[PDB]
């Protein structure tokens, strides 16, 4: 019902380095075209958290807007990576990949984007952990997002933040204490500036609406950059008009209007409650990982 889900905040770049052969429709994602790195995020029933905050950035978008850094190394060569630590981290994370993908990406324990990739003519197995060659396969040109998450820019320092969960020995690759039930649990997490992955007992989010540029979707459908729209008390490259939210902060002309700007439902600054403090995270998401808990 939202016709502007493909009108992305920031640059809207949904490609991964090395796989640039879908740039026509992924750089940027926009109204027209299909993008194998992005479209799966809008399949109803899948990625519910992102679909509730769909006007925030995807992981690839955050990376290309310099909000999230790339892991070092940026990828794990699954064909020959057995025994390496990047395969170790990926293996504790229960994931499902659809067929025909040669890459999948995720936010790792250091709060950086990592990926697993397969050599030419190979695709990821269903668990996203290995590679196989299917003789009848039309391979995608993008990377599959492994986690249900969303991102935003933030300067809020999270250096003193760390994972704290009641009676948990280990969560994913994080050993919280010395120690036991063991199970695959869907754990929420957040990443903050200068922090690592912070797993959470509970996901407590609140959204503060605002009139920042990323809270608006503009069109001429064809996307339009709001930076050309003059603020109230300013001038710009073009002339614009919008809804009540837009006109409260921008100069609405309503005559010779080059673009129309609406307020994006599901934008604004998200804040998360971590150990009784509200903080502004860089990314927030869910992932299915091994959790070991104390019976005692």
């Amino acid at each position, epitope marked *: 019902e939202d016709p502007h889900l493909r009108n992305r905040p920031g640059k809207g770049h949904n490609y991964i380095d090395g*796989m*640039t*052969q879908e740039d026509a429709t992924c750089k940027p994602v926009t109204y027209a075209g299909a993008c194998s790195s992005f479209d799966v995020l809008l399949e109803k029933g899948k990625f519910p958290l992102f679909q509730s905050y769909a006007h925030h950035r995807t992981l690839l978008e955050a990376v290309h807007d310099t909000i999230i850094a790339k892991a070092d*190394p940026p990828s794990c060569d699954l064909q020959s990576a057995h025994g390496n630590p990047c395969m170790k981290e990926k293996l504790v994370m229960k994931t499902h990949c659809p067929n025909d993908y040669q890459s999948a990406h995720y936010l790792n324990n250091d709060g950086k984007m990592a990926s697993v990739k397969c050599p*030419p003519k190979y695709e990821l197995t269903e668990d996203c952990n290995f590679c196989r060659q299917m003789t009848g396969a039309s391979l995608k*040109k993008g990377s599959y997002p492994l986690q249900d998450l969303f991102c935003q820019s933030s300067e809020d320092d999270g250096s003193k933040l760390k994972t704290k969960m009641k009676g948990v020995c280990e969560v994913g690759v994080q050993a919280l204490k010395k120690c036991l039930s063991t199970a695959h649990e869907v754990v929420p997490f957040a990443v903050f500036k200068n922090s690592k992955k912070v797993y959470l007992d509970k996901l407590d989010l609140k959204t503060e609406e605002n009139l920042l540029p990323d809270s608006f979707v503009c069109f001429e459908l064809k996307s339009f950059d709001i930076s050309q729209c003059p603020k109230i008390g300013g001038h710009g490259s073009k002339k614009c008009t919008g809804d009540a939210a837009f006109c409260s902060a921008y100069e609405c002309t309503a005559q010779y209007a080059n673009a129309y700007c609406s307020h994006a439902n599901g934008s604004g600054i998200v804040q998360i409650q971590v150990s009784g403090v509200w903080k502004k995270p860089l990314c927030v998401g869910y992932e299915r990982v091994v959790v070991k808990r104390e019976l005692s």
Partner: antibody
Amino acid sequence: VQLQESGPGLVKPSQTLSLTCTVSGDSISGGDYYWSWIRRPAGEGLEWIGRVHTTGSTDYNPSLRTRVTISIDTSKNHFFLKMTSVTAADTAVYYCAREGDYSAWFDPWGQGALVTVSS
Amino acid sequence: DIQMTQSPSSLSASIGDRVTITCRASQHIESFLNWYQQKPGKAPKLLIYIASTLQGGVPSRFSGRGFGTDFTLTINSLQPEDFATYYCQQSYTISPITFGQGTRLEIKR
């Protein structure tokens, strides 16, 4: 699939270098490939000029983005390079190529067209 | 730009020898590194793509390896027709695609 460059071998300084690449075999229309131009300047290595998608989207080398226009006519299996305000530094062998499906490697290549910039 | 540096810039080797060509990227490019061979009077031709996958029809004496910043093209049993200039090329970024400066292979006889 086979590629072939064609065009004038002599361009005067400050004028416009134009080249055409002809693709043989099946039609590029409907396909999803990128198509690149590469050159080997006189006494130098290889330099990527830019690329155009089957649908018309383009990407250019940043050091050449102001002088280069690459376009495609999929109904005739052609794509085109235009470079304005050429100087002797643009004397080179120019190659067209089809890009890889999953990453921007180059296969196959054209035969190469020598273009000399001179009065 | 991602700078691609090849080593050696030139070398002379005898028929039957092993020739080793190294390519260094100025940053991590995973396996997105491709190798081309250009014989005299001919256009470059793809030899190896994504670091180690051989182009169809290329003989088994050509092989490639590498991941990250250090890549290696190996020609076992050098043959007289292998006289050429060899180039590496990163396909990690298109702004711009960059090539190595080339390695010229001479036949010693």
